[PDB]
Amino acid sequence: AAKDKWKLKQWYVIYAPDFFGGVEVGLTPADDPEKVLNRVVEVTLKDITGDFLKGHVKL
RNA sequence: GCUCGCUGGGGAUACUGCGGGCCUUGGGACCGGGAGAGGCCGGGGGUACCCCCGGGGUAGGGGUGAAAUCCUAUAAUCCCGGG
Ligand SMILES: [Mg+2]
């Protein structure tokens, strides 16, 4: 039954804000889309703009 | 010699005391550019920690030299969003 519970969940794609490019930053699972609101994701500036210098900047 | 103590007079003016004058070195007052977790009062913050509410997940967590009391299915330890 535990496995069955895990099968009810759908995966949602997370996008960066408009002025940062709006690119895809990841995927998160949930059964009800209302539970996705107010979740937070941490990404480095190197992930958005490719440069091996600003790897220590976290957004 | 001892009772080193008292008293009538004369002389000296280096030091101490007293009176007058004149100083700036000790001390104090004031002005300049700086130093400091010195003190008091008002405002704005930093992580950490404890409790409460909502989501996830499920059988352990904590603690000692070794254990046990203790906490946990009225859902803990752990992770996330708020107060
Ligand atoms: Mg809960």
UniProtKB/Swiss-Prot annotation:
It comes from the Archaea. Signal peptide: none annotated. Belongs to the eukaryotic ribosomal protein eS1 family. This is Small ribosomal subunit protein eS1. It comes from Pyrococcus abyssi (strain GE5 / Orsay). The gene is rps3ae. The chain holds residues 9 to 67 of 199 of the full protein.
